[PDB]
């Protein structure tokens, strides 16, 4: 368990790690925002 | 306190990420508003600093 | 003109989609046995015929979902809903088994119609027809196992299953009881099978990499015109390279996409007889010289008698759940085994 | 032996012998044609791939 | 004709669509919901499997009385 | 000019018979040496104790086998991933009865079939071409690499290789099948899909390729004359082809690029095996594939049994059969 | 626009990250970038390890693959492999986390913002993908870097709080690393030695000592190697061997990453002291040696002597011979001889196994750790079920050794992939035929028939 | 009883996602360089 002044914080931390893969779908997005030039 | 401090860090962490690309990207922008940036960066270390003391002297002892 | 001549003109418009006259058996049949399939996976269970559930109402999976065989105790019914042994009633129909036979029944008569639309389509194109010899194999291959397969034996019980691992389930029965893997039939079937991966491997890059410099951009993709009259690849260059680094090379580029034809095909059709055999138990399983020696000196020993010890195993510990009919019961003292484990 | 852990496995003067024999010879060979290189500052290049002769 | 690639976007489909293709999930849902399809196709019910007196599996030993044996083996 | 100028003119020349390069150094000698000892080991070799428990096995024609029950018997159980080469062996005798050949037969083949692979490259080079078949190549070589070395690796055991034989290849598979579950694990099913996908692919192209012929030859000869070494055609004719293909199926569905469809047809069966071996190599390391023992119950807790059920069943009756006198103790760890 | 169009530099959407070759103010940002997602990922991940973090069970029992190697740094860790307290990983976690959003503002100016290319305003920061010297100069840089930071490993081994080893004398605990091992020898006979059965290569290091000398050694290489590629320009028999563009020296590296990977899956499968058994779990061979000296104790004590009792073979029940002479454990793991771990050493002297030590002298936490490394064995299913192929649902375990192992194995070979492709492709584009065969000139046509 | 956790969760994971092409509306609309 965090340390009790972040226990409140829990549900941001268990969605943390999985981040770096939506930057990975968020450049797909942006091509096809432009129309695949 | 801690989590108030903590609260205020992420509010303005989520201002910073939402704000900053926009400047950036467009042409002009970082240029003309290159005055508040220095201060909300200023801000965010500040408050850095004081939640690390904070959490330092609860902890210690 | 007359009704046949009207008839046989809209059939052979251009649409969306050709229908011609192989339409009226192609299009029904598969359609029904489509949905056959969709709603016995998704609804119906197994469990008067088989005693296991299959379906996703009860529990199941993708993976572990099927439309079993039905019942050992109607050996080659045609299972009609009006037959004798349904009489109406649709609930009755499903709980015995019928939809397995619905839906290879109609299945056969789509796989006969697409076939017929191959045909049809070549005429229609004025074209040689031998995309409809290709075909041909796997319809043989569909009619040999799933027809005569339990056909020669007692029942529709001994067929394939429609699911991912009833599938599974045949590979290892058919493994354990006729030594399957042995047969010199088997074996030209994965011959062929794996010779068509490497052809079509070794032709897509042997094309891909001699490409004529036709454009200026580093996408090559974008360096060819729909069709022209030359080629897009050097066949002198092909052939160098690989005579020189294999020892022989193709020269003549029909001979080259016919043998890419015939070499599936073939094995599919090699496989089929195999099939055909194991159904009246004409199975290859003993080596009768190995078998003499190895009872009269029990220090000879062979990959061979490893595989018949496996099978027994399979057999011993497999029967008592896969026939639920027979009602065998198997003490703990008669079960092959080895030490320990 | 088998799990003792010599360099390379050599047990014997022999075979480190014989291995510098066999890097010598080649390298002689190899010498006989590239062995008049210089490091002065005209025999560079500016490319991909050196064409500069030898 | 009228290819897909405007069909997409077609306000009349869209709102046609909006209307029609939520009573088709929502009876898929009441169907599954109600019990009508262990009825339909008879699949047992969870706590169906087995009762008080059969503790055996139900299989059918007969081909011309197979009506006979399921109305037994179900309830009676 | 120099000794060793010509000596590398002669090497990289493209006018041999057979292309010799920087590579064809390490690959002649250990391809011919593997050649040697594989023949002669078939041949003539006594039988070997690969299980470590005194029991030899008879591999060999002259011991009374046949072509499809020979193999060459892998090393010892006793040996374990240890080196054994001749020179540590008291006698040949004693690296015979060992299974000393297997590790020469398998190391010598390895080399070689990774100096065959940068042959490939080498000849592209030198001919001008596009270097990117090799990169096709490797998956075959990724395959028997996993095989032969990586699972003895992961096991701890030369002697949990495949043998190089014809029932032993059966005897790999169904071993495996007992001890790892595979046809449960989704890379298997993705080099199935590459195999079928490869030959219906190859049977359609050929199809169409074929009913796509101009008429040059009329009926007294083969239609093969037609073509000529060096001739200028497309390989097939646009108009009849491509309506047949979007007539038999959906308009939308038709290849209209032949870059792009031999393409797709290099790239299918080439990263299905790339799977199936990393399915291989991964499972080596005790990763096994999905399990469904016992996942159905009904309301009062009894178990309700499903296909896999079944599958479990027959891997229990391998399982409890192999290898009769060698486990002592209750787990096969 | 120019510069992001098919139509000024090929290369379409699918293969749009090679439009940067030449531009070397885009390629810092983006490079940063990457950086700044690693950090961003490392803290996360020690922050989600700890949220879940359970006191009574071990390490390997709750799929943590981040906090086991800050407890072997010495972070928090007792007598026995105990963890005490989590405040450090938050603290790590915490300072990654912040770091990463410096790095990735870095790579977003750098990116978008700063100018297209750096040899027009700061010289010092530029290149032509051709000039030796500078690529020399920057390899030699961030090389004495890399030294820079073996030598902090070194520093903090030794003086800064230790490190955790678990051959202590009394059961793994923190301890300084006083007298590390500088002889050449031992080091570099580590280095030259067989990778087959027995030996190990790299993988066989078995002592704090060694670890530190090495990573000692390994300092002091890459500070003079950084050196003298900064103070030089390759050599003569250098230039004529080697292709200078962008994607070979891509290629380079991408040869050294899988060899690396691969070495790195091998060290998580076979080793014990840099990965001590107390956090990741018991190895391969430690599960089956652990179950024949259960069932050996057992046996013993029901009142067998075992070192007579003869198997269904003949070859010995319990103990037995190894091919070199070793007194071993028998049954089918008599293949896993090699083993050597801290619970079995009190029991070997100078020629395998002591009988009489066997015989009467096992404590018994030493036969509680046989138990839980013979329950505990690395086997386990895709949906993490454990057990052999044939159990049923009943645990759900999975050890990170297996995670470790097949992930970064498979990342090796797919990056052996890469040199392949990205190397034949940077010779063939350097030679100047990566297009197509010249219809003109086509070469086959001039050279004599075979 | 209520369980906020898979609230919280679903409505972090939402806010994340939507965070974005937030970001690339916004410089769509501005007329900057995308
Ligand atoms: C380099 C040459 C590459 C060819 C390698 C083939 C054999 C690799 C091998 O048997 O590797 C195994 C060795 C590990 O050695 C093991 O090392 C162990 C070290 O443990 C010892 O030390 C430990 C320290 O605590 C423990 O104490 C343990 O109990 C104790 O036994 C033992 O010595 C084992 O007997 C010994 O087998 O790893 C290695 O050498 C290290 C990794 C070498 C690089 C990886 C090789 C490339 C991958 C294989 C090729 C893949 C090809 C397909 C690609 C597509
Ligand atoms: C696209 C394909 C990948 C997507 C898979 C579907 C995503 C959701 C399903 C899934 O994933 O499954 C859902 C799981 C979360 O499920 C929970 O997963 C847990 C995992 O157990 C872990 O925890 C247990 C005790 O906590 C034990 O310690 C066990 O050993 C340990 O593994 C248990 O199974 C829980 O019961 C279950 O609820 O997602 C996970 O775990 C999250 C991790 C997924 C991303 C991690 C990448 C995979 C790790 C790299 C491995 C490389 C692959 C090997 C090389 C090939
Ligand atoms: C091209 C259309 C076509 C074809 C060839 C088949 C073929 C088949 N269906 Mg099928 N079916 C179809 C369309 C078709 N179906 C459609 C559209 C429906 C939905 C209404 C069904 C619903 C259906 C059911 C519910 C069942 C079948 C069954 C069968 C099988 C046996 C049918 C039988 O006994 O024939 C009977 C033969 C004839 C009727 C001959 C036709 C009469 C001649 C032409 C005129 C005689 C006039 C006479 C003097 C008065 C057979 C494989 C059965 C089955 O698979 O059992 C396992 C079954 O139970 N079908
Ligand atoms: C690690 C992944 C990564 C990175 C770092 C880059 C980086 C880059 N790519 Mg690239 N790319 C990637 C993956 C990546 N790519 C993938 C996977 C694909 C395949 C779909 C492509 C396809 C691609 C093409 C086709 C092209 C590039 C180009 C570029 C360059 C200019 C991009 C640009 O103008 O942005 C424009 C984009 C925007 C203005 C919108 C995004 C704004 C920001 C970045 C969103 C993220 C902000 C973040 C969430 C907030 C952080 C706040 C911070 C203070 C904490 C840049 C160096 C271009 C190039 O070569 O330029 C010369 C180009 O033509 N890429
Ligand atoms: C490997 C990391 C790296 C490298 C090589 C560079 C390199 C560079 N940066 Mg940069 N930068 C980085 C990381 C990096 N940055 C990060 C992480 C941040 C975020 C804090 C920045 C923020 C940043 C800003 C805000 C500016 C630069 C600028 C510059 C250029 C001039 C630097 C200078 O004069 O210092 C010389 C130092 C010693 C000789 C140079 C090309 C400047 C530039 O190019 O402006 C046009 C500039 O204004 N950088
Ligand atoms: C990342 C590690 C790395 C890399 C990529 C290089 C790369 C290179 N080194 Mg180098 N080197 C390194 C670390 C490294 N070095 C270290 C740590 C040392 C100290 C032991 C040296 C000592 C060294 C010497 C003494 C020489 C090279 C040379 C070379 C060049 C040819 C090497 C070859 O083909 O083999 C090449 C540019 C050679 C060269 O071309 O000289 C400039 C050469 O003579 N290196
Ligand atoms: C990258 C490659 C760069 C080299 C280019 C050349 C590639 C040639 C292909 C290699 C084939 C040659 C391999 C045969 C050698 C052999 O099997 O040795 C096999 C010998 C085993 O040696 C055996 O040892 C036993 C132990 O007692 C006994 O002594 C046996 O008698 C003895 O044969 O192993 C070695 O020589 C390994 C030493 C080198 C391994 C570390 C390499 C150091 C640099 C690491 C970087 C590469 C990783
Ligand atoms: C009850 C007895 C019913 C018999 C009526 C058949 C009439 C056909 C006349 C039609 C006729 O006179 O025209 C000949 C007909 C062509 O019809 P058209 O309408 O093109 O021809 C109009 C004129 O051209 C001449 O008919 O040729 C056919 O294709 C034959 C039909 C196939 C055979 C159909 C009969 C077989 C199925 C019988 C149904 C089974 C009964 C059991
Ligand atoms: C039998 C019968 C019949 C018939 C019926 C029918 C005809 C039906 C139909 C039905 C149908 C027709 C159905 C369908 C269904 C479907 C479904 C159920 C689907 C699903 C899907 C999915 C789920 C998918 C998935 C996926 C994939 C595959 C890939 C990608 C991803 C995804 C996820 C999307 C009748 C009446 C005659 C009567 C008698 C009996
Ligand atoms: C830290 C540590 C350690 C270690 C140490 C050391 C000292 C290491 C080293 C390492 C090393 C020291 C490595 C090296 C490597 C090398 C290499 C890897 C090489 C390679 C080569 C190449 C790659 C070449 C190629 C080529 C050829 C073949 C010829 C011509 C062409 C070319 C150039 C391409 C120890 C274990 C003690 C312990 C733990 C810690
Ligand atoms: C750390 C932190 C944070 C966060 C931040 C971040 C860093 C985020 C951003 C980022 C993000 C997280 C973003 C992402 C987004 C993404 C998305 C959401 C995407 C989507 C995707 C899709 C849907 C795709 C699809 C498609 C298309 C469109 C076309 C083509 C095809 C495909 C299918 C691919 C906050 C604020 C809480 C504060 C505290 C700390
Ligand atoms: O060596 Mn060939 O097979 Ca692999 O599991 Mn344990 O070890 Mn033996 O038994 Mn089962
Ligand atoms: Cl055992
Ligand atoms: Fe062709």
């Not at chain 5, 197979?66 to 083996?73: I, R, S, V």
């Not at chain 6, 299974?99 to 037969?105: A, T, V």
């Not at chain 7, 810092?28 to 922050?47: E, Q, S, T, Y």
Request: aromatic share 14%; glycine share 10%.
């Amino acid at each position: 368990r965090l340390p009790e002044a972040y226990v409140v914080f829990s549900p941001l931390v268990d969605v943390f790690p999985v981040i770096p893969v939506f930057f990975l779908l968020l450049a797909f997005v942006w091509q096809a925002a432009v129309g695949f030039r | 306190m801690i989590t108030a401090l903590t609260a205020l860090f992420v509010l303005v962490s989520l201002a910073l990420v939402v704000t900053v690309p926009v400047a950036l990207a467009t042409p002009g922008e970082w240029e003309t508003s290159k005055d508040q940036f220095n201060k909300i960066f200023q801000l965010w270390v500040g408050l850095v600093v004081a939640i690390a003391t904070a959490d330092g002297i609860s902890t210690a002892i | 003109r007359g009704l046949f001549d009207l008839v046989d003109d809209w059939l052979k418009r251009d649409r969306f989609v050709f229908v011609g006259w192989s339409g009226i058996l192609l299009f029904p049949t598969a359609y029904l046995a489509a949905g056959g399939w969709f709603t016995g996976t998704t609804f119906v269970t197994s469990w008067y015929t088989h005693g296991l559930a299959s379906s996703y109402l009860e529990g199941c999976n993708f993976l572990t979902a099927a439309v079993s065989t039905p019942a050992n105790s109607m050996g080659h019914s045609l299972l009609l809903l009006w037959g004798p042994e349904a009489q109406g009633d649709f609930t009755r129909w499903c709980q015995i088994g019928g939809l397995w036979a619905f839906i290879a029944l109609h299945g056969a008569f789509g796989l006969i119609g697409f076939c017929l639309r191959q045909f049809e389509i070549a005429r229609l194109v004025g074209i040689r027809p031998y995309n409809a010899i290709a075909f041909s194999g796997p319809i043989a291959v569909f009619v040999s196992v799933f027809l005569l397969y339990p056909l020669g034996q007692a029942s529709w019980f001994f067929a394939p299953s429609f699911g991912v691992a009833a599938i599974f389930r045949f590979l290892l029965f058919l493994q354990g009881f006729h030594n399957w893997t042995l047969n010199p039939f088997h074996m030209m079937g994965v011959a062929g099978i794996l010779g068509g991966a490497l052809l079509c491997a070794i032709h897509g890059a042997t094309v891909e990499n001699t490409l004529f410099e036709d454009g200026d951009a580093a996408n090559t993709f974008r360096a060819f015109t729909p069709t022209q009259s030359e080629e897009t690849y050097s066949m002198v260059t092909a052939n160098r390279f690989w005579s020189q680094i294999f020892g022989v090379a193709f020269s003549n580029k029909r001979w080259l996409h016919f043998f890419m034809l015939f070499v599936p095909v073939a094995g599919l059709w090699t496989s089929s007889i195999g099939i055909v055999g194991l159904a009246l138990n004409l199975r290859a399983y003993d080596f009768v010289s190995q078998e003499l020696r190895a009872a009269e000196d029990p220090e000879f020993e062979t990959f061979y008698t490893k595989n018949i010890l496996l099978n027994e195993g399979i057999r011993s510990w497999m029967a008592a759940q896969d026939q639920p009919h027979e009602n065998f019961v198997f003490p703990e003292e008669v079960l092959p085994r080895g030490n320990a484990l | 032996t088998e799990g003792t852990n010599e360099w390379f496995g050599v047990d014997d003067i022999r075979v480190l012998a014989v291995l510098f024999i066999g890097h010598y010879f080649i390298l002689s060979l190899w010498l006989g044609q590239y062995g008049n290189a210089t490091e002065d500052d005209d025999a560079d290049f500016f490319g991909e791939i050196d064409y500069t002769g030898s | 004709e009228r290819p897909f690639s405007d069909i997409i976007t077609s306000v009349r489909y869209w709102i046609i669509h909006t209307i029609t293709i939520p009573s088709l999930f929502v009876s898929g849902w009441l169907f599954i919901s109600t019990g009508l399809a262990y009825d339909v196709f008879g699949t047992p019910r969870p706590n169906e499997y087995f009762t008080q007196d059969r503790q055996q599996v139900p299989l059918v030993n007969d081909r011309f009385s197979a009506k006979q044996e399921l109305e037994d083996l179900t309830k009676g | 000019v120099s000794l060793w100028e010509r000596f590398c003119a002669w090497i990289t020349s493209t006018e041999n018979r057979l292309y010799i390069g920087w590579f064809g150094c390490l690959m002649f000698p250990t391809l011919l040496t593997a050649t040697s000892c594989f023949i002669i080991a078939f041949i003539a070799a006594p039988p070997v104790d690969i299980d470590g428990i005194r029991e030899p096995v008879a591999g060999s024609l002259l011991y009374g086998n046949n072509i499809i029950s020979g193999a060459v018997i892998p090393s010892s159980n006793a040996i374990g991933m240890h080196f054994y080469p001749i020179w540590e062996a008291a006698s040949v005798d004693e690296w015979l009865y060992n299974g000393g050949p297997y590790q020469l037969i398998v190391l010598h083949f390895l080399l070689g079939v990774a100096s065959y692979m940068g042959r490939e490259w080498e000849l592209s080079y030198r001919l001008g071409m596009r270097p990117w078949i090799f990169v096709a190549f490797s998956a075959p070589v990724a395959a028997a690499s996993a095989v032969f070395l990586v699972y003895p690796i992961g096991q701890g055991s030369f002697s949990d290789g495949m043998p190089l034989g014809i029932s032993g290849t059966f005897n790999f598979m169904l071993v495996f099948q007992a001890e790892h579950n595979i046809l449960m694990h989704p890379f298997h099913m993705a080099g199935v899909a590459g195999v079928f996908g490869g030959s219906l692919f190859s049977a359609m192209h050929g199809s169409l390729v074929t009913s796509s012929l101009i008429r040059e030859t009329t009926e007294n000869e083969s239609t093969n004359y037609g073509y000529k070494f060096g001739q200028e055609e497309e390989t097939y004719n646009i108009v009849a082809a491509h309506g047949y293909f979007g007539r038999l199926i959906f308009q939308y569905a038709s290849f209209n690029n032949s870059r792009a469809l031999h393409f797709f047809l290099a790239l299918w069966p080439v990263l299905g095996i790339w799977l199936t071996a990393m399915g291989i190599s991964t499972m080596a390391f005790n990763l096994n594939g999905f399990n469904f023992n016992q996942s159905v119950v009904d309301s009062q807790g009894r178990v309700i049994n499903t296909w896999a059920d079944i599958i479990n069943r027959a891997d229990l009756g391998m399982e409890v059969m192999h290898e009769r006198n060698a486990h002592n103790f209750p787990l096969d760890l | 626009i120019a510069g992001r169009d098919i139509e000024s530099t090929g290369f379409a959407w699918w293969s749009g990250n090679a439009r940067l070759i030449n531009v070397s103010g885009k390629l810092l940002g983006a490079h940063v970038a990457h950086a700044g997602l690693m950090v961003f990922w490392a803290g996360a991940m020690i922050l989600f390890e700890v949220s879940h973090f359970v006191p009574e069970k071990p390490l390997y029992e709750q799929g943590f693959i981040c906090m086991q190697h800050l407890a072997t740094l010495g972070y928090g860790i007792g007598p026995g492999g105990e963890i005490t307290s989590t405040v450090p990983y938050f603290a790590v976690g915490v300072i990654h986390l912040i770091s990463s959003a410096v790095l990735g503002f870095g790579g977003i100016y750098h990116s978008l913002l700063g100018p297209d290319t750096l040899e027009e305003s700061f010289p010092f920061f530029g290149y032509d993908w051709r000039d030796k010297n500078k690529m020399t100069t920057i390899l030699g840089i961030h090389l004495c870097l890399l030294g820079l930071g073996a030598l902090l490993l070194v520093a903090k081994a030794m003086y800064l709080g230790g490190v955790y080893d678990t051959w202590a004398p009394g059961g793994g605990d923190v301890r300084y690393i006083t007298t590390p091992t500088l002889n050449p020898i031992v080091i570099f006979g580590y280095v030259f030695r067989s990778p087959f059965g027995g030996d190990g290569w790299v993988v066989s290091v078995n002592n704090m000592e060694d670890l530190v000398g090495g990573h000692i050694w390994v300092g002091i290489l890459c500070i003079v190697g950084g050196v003298w590629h900064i103070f030089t320009k390759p050599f003569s028999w250098a230039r004529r061997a080697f292709v200078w563009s962008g994607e070979a020296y891509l290629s380079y590296s991408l040869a050294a990453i899988s060899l690396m990977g691969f070495t790195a899956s091998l060290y998580a499968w076979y080793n014990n002291t840099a990965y001590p058994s107390e956090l990741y779990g018991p190895t391969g061979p430690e599960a089956s040696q652990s179950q024949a000296f259960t069932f050996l104790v057992r046996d013993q004590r029901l009142g067998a002597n075992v070192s007579s009792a003869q198997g269904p073979t003949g070859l010995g029940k319990y103990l037995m011979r190894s091919p070199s002479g070793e007194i071993i454990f028998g049954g089918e793991t008599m293949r896993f001889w090699d083993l050597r771990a801290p619970w079995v050493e009190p029991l070997r002297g100078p020629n395998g196994l002591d009988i009489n030590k066997i015989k009467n002298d096992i404590q018994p936490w030493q036969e509680r750790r046989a138990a839980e490394y013979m329950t505990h064995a690395p086997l386990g299913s895709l949906n993490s079920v454990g057990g052999v192929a044939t159990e049923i649902n009943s645990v759900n375990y999975v050890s990170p050794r297996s995670w470790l192992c097949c992930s970064h194995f498979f990342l090796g070979f797919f990056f052996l992939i890469g040199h392949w492709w990205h190397s034949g492709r940077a010779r063939a584009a350097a030679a100047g035929f990566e297009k197509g065969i010249n219809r003109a000139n086509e070469p086959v046509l001039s050279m004599r028939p075979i | 009883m209520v369980n906020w956790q898979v609230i919280g969760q679903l409505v972090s994971t939402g806010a994340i996602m939507l965070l974005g092409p937030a970001i690339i509306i916004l410089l769509a609309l501005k007329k900057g360089n995308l």
